[PDB]
Design an enzyme around this catalytic site. Structure first.
Site, mmCIF file in Angstrom:
data_model
loop_
_atom_site.group_PDB
_atom_site.id
_atom_site.type_symbol
_atom_site.label_atom_id
_atom_site.label_comp_id
_atom_site.label_asym_id
_atom_site.label_seq_id
_atom_site.Cartn_x
_atom_site.Cartn_y
_atom_site.Cartn_z
ATOM 1 C CD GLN A 1 36.180 126.952 19.265
ATOM 2 O OE1 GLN A 1 35.276 127.757 19.486
ATOM 3 N NE2 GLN A 1 37.307 127.289 18.647
ATOM 4 C CE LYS B 1 40.624 128.760 19.197
ATOM 5 N NZ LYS B 1 40.469 127.373 18.752
ATOM 6 C CG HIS C 1 41.956 121.663 16.910
ATOM 7 N ND1 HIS C 1 43.254 121.764 17.360
ATOM 8 C CD2 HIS C 1 41.725 122.781 16.174
ATOM 9 C CE1 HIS C 1 43.804 122.864 16.874
ATOM 10 N NE2 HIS C 1 42.894 123.502 16.156
ATOM 11 C CG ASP D 1 40.099 120.488 22.693
ATOM 12 O OD1 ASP D 1 39.987 121.606 23.256
ATOM 13 O OD2 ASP D 1 40.636 120.336 21.577
#
Lengths: 402, 403
Positions: B201, B224, B121, B198
């Protein structure tokens, strides 16, 4: 407009708190401010009805709200929304200037001028980048009444000074500095000004553009707003010329491993998902204060300040740190033979919230020669009856330490 | 096993209508929805004990401090890390930039290589482009194979001695791919390569034992994983937090300030300057406890069922192409359809009450490898239902035949 202050107070549900079995007196508004139900409910409604990123229906309303808040905060400061960078607080705002304006420009022989009464947020970023650039820091001194020494300030603004960090309102002294006249002279001398507005915008009308400064920082939680909110205003020429600070999504236009093209300000300086809920609430907070009228807030708090100061002067052995001719409703004080931390501790047990300590202004307290002040700081939702109750508690507490 | 119907009732927003139709929120990868425990935690803070934290004096300040540091401890248990090594910040984006500015910027020089995967991302690309811009480091790309998986053969071949840092996502926000970060970080550490993982997610969709990954830095974002906006965290090995210079300067991160010289706090407060997002992090602590209470393994199993149902029915659509079919995957499906613009799919699906996202999803280089200008992305959460999946496919058929 002249609002009904007893009605206004009922907007603030935290003021119904009891602590230690007593009704709360919240005199720590300089540490953080309380929120009107309009602000608390705006955040609640976002999470319950249109939580989405900033597209589809919920994403569309979330975006209009988010940018709507920037427009509202910009009208609150009388600046253009495109010149207004939204961030997590004053501290982030000043570090943005430190890393993106000063760090690429300063060199050995340049001087950063910082007043003796600056909060650490307007000191520590400059020390970091001075150490990295070879620049040196000079202190603009104050006088014992808590005023900025304007004569000493003028004489200190020599050609090698490239930036002046100056508070609009001191969080310890309450002093209101003449930022308009200060920034007008600094501009005459080619000196960039970074004005810390954190304690100005909650307590008076601030027309940021009329100040004539280069950078102006505010923090949302002290002006009826949610935590994690704030903003930096800056001249458009500066936002255009500065390199990006944080990198990521939303501040880019096109990303490629061969090279990335960045957005224009203000989004240029807003990396990643914003604090969407918090800024929706700050929009409501800024609109709430404008509907009250910022000048009415200032007059109300000056009436509270005069009452509190008149009664506090009758206390034997008390002295006020910060006796400038213009000040916001912030009173730092000491009492002979009483430790400021004992005063705060015992006042808490009487329901009264104050703060004893150094208030993240260690050089300022060093100049005054004291290890701490007890600070009572008032807001428009405080009452004259609370002030009379405070004086009764102080007398009882001081007798407990006698 | 949790009662999933009762779990969905914790989320009050899912009750609303859109254009007079029921809302079907399939845009969870953009941001997640919040349980009432989180929403009321934030509301209760402002109503009942709003005050500043640290060096607490009065009753409300003490309550606020206990709640705020309590939230750091709850998040730390969520990640199976020590709270002393967990820096709280405004999102993944800030977390990675802190690595970029305080680890890489003072260390990398011209000739050094930063290795970044094709599927990262922008949050895990742009900070490293700023570092290269100011150090002369060069960026090299770790490629993927057409099924959306990270080409491990090419990754080992790419991890030469000049590589000093690897930016690798745990879970792709576009492909859904779950990368073997444990294997990757072990091989990176063997070559003296710092890993920045990262996890934005990952942690809302599966159990992550961050410490068992063996990475140097791990970044998450609060909104999230059922949490308030403006929240997130950076975990790091203790040796890095101690060696790294401060990033933002101000209150709370100092110990003593003088114009003759300032002394800084230790980690984590060393890296948390000024007043925190107190309300947001109190709510994020409740989000972490809510997910630990459900069981992260239970969530992963639930969303895998939802994914399998959604994917099996999606693959019945004629001319439909799924971009990202790696072996292990989170419940994220990016897809295209022949004759259908991705943007037109989203615009019309919304008119049926379905919320999805079409575009590049802040992963422009990944889309360049596939040669597509956009995709339509449905991203499921545990509070979605199999019934919604079926309602979705009916809206897709209605919308596909409308164009």
């Amino acid at each position: 407009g002249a609002p009904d202050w007893d009605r206004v107070r009922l907007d603030f549900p935290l003021l119904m708190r009891e602590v230690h079995g007593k009704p709360l007196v919240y005199f720590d508004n300089a540490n953080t401010g309380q929120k009107p139900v309009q602000v608390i409910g705006a955040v609640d409604e976002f999470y319950r009805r249109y939580n989405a990123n900033v597209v589809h229906a919920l994403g569309s309303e979330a975006t209009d709200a988010y940018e709507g808040a920037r427009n509202t905060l910009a009208r609150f400061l009388n600046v253009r929304p495109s010149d207004l960078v939204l961030c997590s607080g004053t501290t982030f705002a000043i570090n943005l200037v430190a890393y993106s304006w000063a760090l690429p420009r300063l060199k050995a022989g340049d001087v950063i001028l910082i007043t003796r009464m600056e909060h650490h947020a307007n000191i520590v970023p400059w020390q970091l980048v001075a150490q990295r650039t070879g620049a040196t820091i000079r202190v603009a001194e104050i006088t014992p009444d808590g005023a900025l020494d304007l004569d000493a300030l003028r004489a200190a603004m020599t050609p090698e000074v490239k930036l002046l960090a100056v508070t609009h309102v001191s969080n310890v002294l309450g002093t209101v500095n003449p930022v308009r006249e200060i920034c007008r002279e600094a501009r005459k001398r080619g000196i960039i000004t970074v004005v810390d507005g954190s304690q100005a915008v909650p307590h008076r009308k601030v027309d940021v553009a009329a100040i004539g400064c280069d950078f102006y920082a505010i923090t949302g939680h002290k002006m009826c707003g949610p935590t994690g909110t704030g903003a930096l205003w800056a001249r458009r020429e500066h936002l255009d010329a500065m390199p990006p600070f944080l990198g990521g999504g939303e501040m880019i236009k096109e990303v490629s491993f061969d090279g990335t093209v960045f957005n224009d300000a203000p989004h240029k300086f807003e990396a990643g998902t914003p604090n969407i809920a918090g800024f929706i609430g700050l929009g409501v907070a800024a609109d709430y204060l404008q509907q009250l009228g910022q000048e009415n807030v200032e007059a109300r708090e000056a009436e509270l300040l005069a009452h509190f100061t008149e009664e506090l002067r009758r206390v034997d052995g008390l002295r006020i740190i910060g006796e400038a001719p213009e000040k916001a409703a912030v009173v730092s004080f000491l009492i002979d033979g009483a430790h400021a931390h004992d005063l705060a501790t015992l006042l808490d047990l009487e329901g009264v919230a104050v703060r004893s300590g150094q208030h993240c202004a260690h050089p300022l307290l060093q100049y005054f020669g004291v290890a701490a002040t007890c600070r009572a700081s008032l807001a428009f939702y405080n009452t004259h009856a609370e002030i009379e109750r405070f004086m009764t508690a102080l007398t009882k507490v001081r007798k407990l330490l006698g």
